[PDB]
């Protein structure tokens, strides 16, 4: 715990495009890595205001902050100081697709996150492009080792302003930059909340709690 302290800050930069609309976001976060809690404030720096739902971006802003039982190795914490990378595909139920690539490193005592995101094929009348979503329900991520990396699968659900839910099938691969002890399969319960936003979602605060279990 000379590397990952009980309190850690992070900085994040995202470049993205959704249905061809380019944007950039810069953010600052902090949290308690061993307790599985964190917050962040994100600001749209280019392309604002965004003409689509913030909710598709919120899960791209930190798996060093997952509470783990003592008998499950914390693969992503152990990847530091070098860090780890992750890539993700989210297949939404109406054909929209989000692809993400991310690098996580440790610089001068803070985590540094760099993200690229592409969203495509969202229907112009759908809840993403019409901003009719209302946050994520609690998620269960199934973690499993495969092919030398740590993988996760989620059946993720967005609440709809008009009622019901909008589903995404999510697959992620997380890989330490140096060889690290891979854990056996386990589950992570995640809850991400938007705790504040201005009217056009150009400044947004998030909170996330994440805990692994057998």
């Amino acid at each position, epitope marked *: 715990m000379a590397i990952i302290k009980e309190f850690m800050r992070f900085k994040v930069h995202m470049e993205g495009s959704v249905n061809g609309h380019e944007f950039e976001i810069e953010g600052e976060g902090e949290g308690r890595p061993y307790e599985g809690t964190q917050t962040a404030k994100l600001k749209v720096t280019k392309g604002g205001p965004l003409p689509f739902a913030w909710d598709i971006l919120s899960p791209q802003f930190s798996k060093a902050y997952v509470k783990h039982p003592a008998d499950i190795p914390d693969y992503l914490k152990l990847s530091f100081p070098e860090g780890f*990378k992750w890539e993700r*595909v989210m297949n939404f139920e109406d054909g929209g697709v989000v692809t993400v*690539t991310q690098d996580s490193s440790l610089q001068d005592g803070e985590f540094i996150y760099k993200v690229k995101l592409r969203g495509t094929n969202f229907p112009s009348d759908g809840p993403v492009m019409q901003k009719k979503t209302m946050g994520w329900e609690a998620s269960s991520e199934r973690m499993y080792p495969e092919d*030398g990396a740590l993988k996760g699968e989620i059946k993720q659900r967005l609440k709809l302003k008009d009622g019901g839910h909008y589903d995404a099938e999510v697959k992620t691969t997380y*890989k330490a930059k140096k060889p690290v002890q891979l854990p056996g399969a386990y589950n992570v319960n995640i809850k991400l909340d938007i705790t504040s936003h201005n009217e056009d979602y150009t400044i947004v605060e998030q909170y996330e709690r994440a805990e692994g279990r057998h």
Partner: nanobody, 124 residues
Framework: VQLVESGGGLVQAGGSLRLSCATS????????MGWFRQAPGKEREFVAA????????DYADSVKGRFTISRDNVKNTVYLQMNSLKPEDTAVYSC???????????????????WGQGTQVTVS
């Protein structure tokens, strides 16, 4: 660093074949990989590329839906499955490893390196 392609050949239109690229000398999962093709007299052109995890793929419009790029991060191999082949697909197909390792939908010859010598595909 070292890439060697195989799996080409001569097939009828409507056929299906699969190219593979063996690799050596680098950490395979540190690199995006790409397939390019070169027909007589034309410029070497982008076919498909795949990120380190396999989750992010990109295809030339001419082959989308007919070809699939994939990779095996244990065997350290890249594949190009080629279905619904047309005479216009005839070319030498070569594989390359990306510039840096963080790659993002980059299709230029110049963003890739460490080219293999390629494998001939001829469709009649």
């Amino acid at each position: 660093v070292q890439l060697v392609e195989s799996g080409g050949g001569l097939v009828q239109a409507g056929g299906s074949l699969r190219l593979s690229c063996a690799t050596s000398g680098f950490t395979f999962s540190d690199y995006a990989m790409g397939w390019f093709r070169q027909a007589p007299g034309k410029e070497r052109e982008f076919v498909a590329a795949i990120s380190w995890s396999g989750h992010v793929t990109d295809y030339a419009d001419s082959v989308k839906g007919r070809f699939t790029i994939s990779r095996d991060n244990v065997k350290n191999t890249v594949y190009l499955q080629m279905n619904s082949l047309k005479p216009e697909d005839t070319a030498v197909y070569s594989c390359a490893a990306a510039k840096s390792g963080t790659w993002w939908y980059q299709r230029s010859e110049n963003d890739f390196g460490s080219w293999g010598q390629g494998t001939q595909v001829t469709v009649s």
